[PDB]
Short mmCIF file of C-alpha atoms in Angstrom, two decimals:
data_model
loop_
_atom_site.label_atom_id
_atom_site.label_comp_id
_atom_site.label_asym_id
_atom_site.label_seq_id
_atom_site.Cartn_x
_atom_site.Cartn_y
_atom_site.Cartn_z
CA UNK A 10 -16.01 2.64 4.79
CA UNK A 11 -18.99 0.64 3.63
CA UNK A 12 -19.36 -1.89 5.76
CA UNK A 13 -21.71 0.25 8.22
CA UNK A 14 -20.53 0.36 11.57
CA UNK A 15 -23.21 1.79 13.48
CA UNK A 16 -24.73 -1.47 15.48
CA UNK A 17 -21.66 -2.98 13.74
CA UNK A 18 -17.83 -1.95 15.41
CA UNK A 19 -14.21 -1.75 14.19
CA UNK A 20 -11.24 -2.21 16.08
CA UNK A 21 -7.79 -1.63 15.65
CA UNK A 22 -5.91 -4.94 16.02
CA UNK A 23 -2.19 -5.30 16.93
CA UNK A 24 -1.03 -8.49 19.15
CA UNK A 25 -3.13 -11.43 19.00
CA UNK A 26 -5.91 -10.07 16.54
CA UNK A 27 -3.91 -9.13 13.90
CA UNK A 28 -4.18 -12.18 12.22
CA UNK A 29 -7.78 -12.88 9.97
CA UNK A 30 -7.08 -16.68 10.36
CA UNK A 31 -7.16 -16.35 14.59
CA UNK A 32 -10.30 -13.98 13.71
CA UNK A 33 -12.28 -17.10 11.93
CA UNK A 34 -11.43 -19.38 14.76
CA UNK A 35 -12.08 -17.08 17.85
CA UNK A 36 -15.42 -16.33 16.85
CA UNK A 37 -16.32 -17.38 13.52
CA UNK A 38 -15.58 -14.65 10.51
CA UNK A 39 -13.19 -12.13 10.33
CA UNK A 40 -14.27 -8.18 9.66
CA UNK A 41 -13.61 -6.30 6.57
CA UNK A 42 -9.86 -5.19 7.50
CA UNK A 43 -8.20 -1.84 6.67
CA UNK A 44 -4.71 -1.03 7.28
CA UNK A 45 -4.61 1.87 9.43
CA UNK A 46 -2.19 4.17 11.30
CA UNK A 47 -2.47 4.97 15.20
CA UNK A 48 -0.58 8.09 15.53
CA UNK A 49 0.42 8.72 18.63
CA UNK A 50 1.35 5.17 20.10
CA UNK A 51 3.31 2.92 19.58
CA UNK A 52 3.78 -0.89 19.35
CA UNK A 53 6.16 -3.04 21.44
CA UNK A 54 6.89 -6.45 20.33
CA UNK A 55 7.52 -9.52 22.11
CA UNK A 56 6.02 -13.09 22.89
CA UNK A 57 6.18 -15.79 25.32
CA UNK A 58 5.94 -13.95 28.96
CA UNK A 59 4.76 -10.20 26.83
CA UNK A 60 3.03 -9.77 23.69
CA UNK A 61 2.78 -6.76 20.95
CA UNK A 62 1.48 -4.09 23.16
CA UNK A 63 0.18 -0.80 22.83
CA UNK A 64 1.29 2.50 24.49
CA UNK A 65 0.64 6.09 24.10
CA UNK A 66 4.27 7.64 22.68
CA UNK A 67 4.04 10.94 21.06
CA UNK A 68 7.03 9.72 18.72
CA UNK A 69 5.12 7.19 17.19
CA UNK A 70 2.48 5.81 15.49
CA UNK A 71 1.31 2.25 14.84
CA UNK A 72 0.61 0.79 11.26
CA UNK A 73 -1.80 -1.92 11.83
CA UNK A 74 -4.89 -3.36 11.19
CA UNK A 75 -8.45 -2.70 11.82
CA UNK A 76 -11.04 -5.12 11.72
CA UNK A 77 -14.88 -3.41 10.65
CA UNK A 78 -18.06 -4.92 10.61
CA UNK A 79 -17.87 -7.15 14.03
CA UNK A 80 -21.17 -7.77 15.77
CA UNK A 81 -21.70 -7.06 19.69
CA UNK A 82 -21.38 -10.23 21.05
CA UNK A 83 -17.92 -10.81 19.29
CA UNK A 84 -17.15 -6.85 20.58
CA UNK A 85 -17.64 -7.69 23.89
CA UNK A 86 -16.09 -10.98 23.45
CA UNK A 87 -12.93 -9.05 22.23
CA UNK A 88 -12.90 -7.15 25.51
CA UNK A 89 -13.74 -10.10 27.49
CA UNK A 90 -10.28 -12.30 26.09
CA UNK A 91 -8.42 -9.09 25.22
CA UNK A 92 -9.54 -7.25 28.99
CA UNK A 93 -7.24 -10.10 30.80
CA UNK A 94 -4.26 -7.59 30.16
CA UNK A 95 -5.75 -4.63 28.37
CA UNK A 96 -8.35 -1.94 28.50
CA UNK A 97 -10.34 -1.20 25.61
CA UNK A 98 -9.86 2.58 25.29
CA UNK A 99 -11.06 4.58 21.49
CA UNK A 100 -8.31 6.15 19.12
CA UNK A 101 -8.15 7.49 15.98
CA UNK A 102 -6.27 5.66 13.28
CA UNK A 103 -5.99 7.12 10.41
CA UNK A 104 -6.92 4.90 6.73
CA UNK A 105 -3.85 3.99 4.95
CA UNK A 106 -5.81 3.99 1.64
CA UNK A 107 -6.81 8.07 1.51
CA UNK A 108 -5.21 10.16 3.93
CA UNK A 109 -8.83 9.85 6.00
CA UNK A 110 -9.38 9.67 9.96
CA UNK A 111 -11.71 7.54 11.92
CA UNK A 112 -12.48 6.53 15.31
CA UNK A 113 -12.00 3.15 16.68
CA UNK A 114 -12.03 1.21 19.57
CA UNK A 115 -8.43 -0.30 20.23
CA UNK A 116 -6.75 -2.34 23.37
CA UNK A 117 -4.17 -0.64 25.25
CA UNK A 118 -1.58 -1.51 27.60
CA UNK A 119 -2.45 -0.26 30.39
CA UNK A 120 0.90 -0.10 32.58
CA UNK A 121 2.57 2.75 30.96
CA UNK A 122 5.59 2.52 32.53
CA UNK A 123 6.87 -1.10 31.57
CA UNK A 124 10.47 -2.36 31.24
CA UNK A 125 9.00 -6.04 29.73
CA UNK A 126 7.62 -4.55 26.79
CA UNK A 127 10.93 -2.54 25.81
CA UNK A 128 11.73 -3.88 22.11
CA UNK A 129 11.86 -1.78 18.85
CA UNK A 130 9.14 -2.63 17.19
CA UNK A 131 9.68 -3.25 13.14
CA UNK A 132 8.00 -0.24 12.11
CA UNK A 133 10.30 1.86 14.37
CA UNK A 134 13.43 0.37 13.00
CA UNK A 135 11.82 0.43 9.49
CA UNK A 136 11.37 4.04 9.96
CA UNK A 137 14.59 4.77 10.90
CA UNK A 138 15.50 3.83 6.77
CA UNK A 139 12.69 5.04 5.35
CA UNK A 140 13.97 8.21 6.11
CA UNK A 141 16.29 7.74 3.28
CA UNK A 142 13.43 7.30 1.13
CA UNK A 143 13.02 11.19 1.56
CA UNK A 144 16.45 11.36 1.77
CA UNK A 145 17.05 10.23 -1.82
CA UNK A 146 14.74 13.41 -2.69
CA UNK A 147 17.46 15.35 -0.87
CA UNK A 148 20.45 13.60 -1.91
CA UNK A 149 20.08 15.15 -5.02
CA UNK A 150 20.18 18.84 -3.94
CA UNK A 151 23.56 18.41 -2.12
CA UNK A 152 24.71 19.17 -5.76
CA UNK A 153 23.38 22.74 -5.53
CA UNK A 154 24.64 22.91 -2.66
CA UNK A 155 28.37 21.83 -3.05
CA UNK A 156 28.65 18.15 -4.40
CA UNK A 157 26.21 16.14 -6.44
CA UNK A 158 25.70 13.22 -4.60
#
């Protein structure tokens, strides 16, 4: 972090925001973004009647965006269009560059208990393979164990 956010703000984007070119339209410039990692939630996907949503899960952790070095106005104006459907509640998402944790402000679903948003989101399904990633590590020891595999 360089970009100073101390009259400045950074938010954690995920439906709607996660895209810089939206960003330049919706107010005028988009943020220095970061990917980041919102451990304990997780991300829903959907569009048309629901969008990519938010929620608290324990399991699971959201790989997204964060936008740093948005002005007030722009801030509020986030909550303003983002508030319709969402509350703007802080997290802490941790920097996919270093290993480092921050604080950020974020929009979350607020109905906790929704059937709509029930999808698996990408992430989930990519994590369910990049398990084998570690796997592979492991695969290898079976042959201590028995059978080289």
């Amino acid at each position: 972090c360089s970009s100073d956010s101390l009259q400045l703000h950074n938010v954690f984007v995920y439906g709607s925001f996660q895209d810089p070119d939206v960003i330049n339209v919706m107010l005028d410039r988009t943020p220095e973004i970061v990917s980041a990692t919102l451990p304990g939630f997780q991300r829903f996907r959907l569009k048309g009647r629901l969008y990519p949503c938010i929620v608290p899960s324990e399991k699971g952790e959201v790989h997204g965006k964060v936008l740093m070095g948005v002005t007030s106005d722009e801030l509020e104006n986030l909550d303003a269009v983002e508030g319709n459907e969402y509350e703007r509640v802080t997290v802490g998402i941790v920097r996919e560059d270093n290993s480092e944790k921050m604080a950020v402000k974020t929009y979350m679903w607020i109905n906790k208990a929704d059937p709509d948003m029930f999808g698996e989101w990408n992430f989930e399904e990519w994590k369910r393979l990049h398990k084998k990633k570690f796997i592979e590590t492991f695969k290898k020891i079976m042959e201590c164990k028995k059978k080289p595999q």
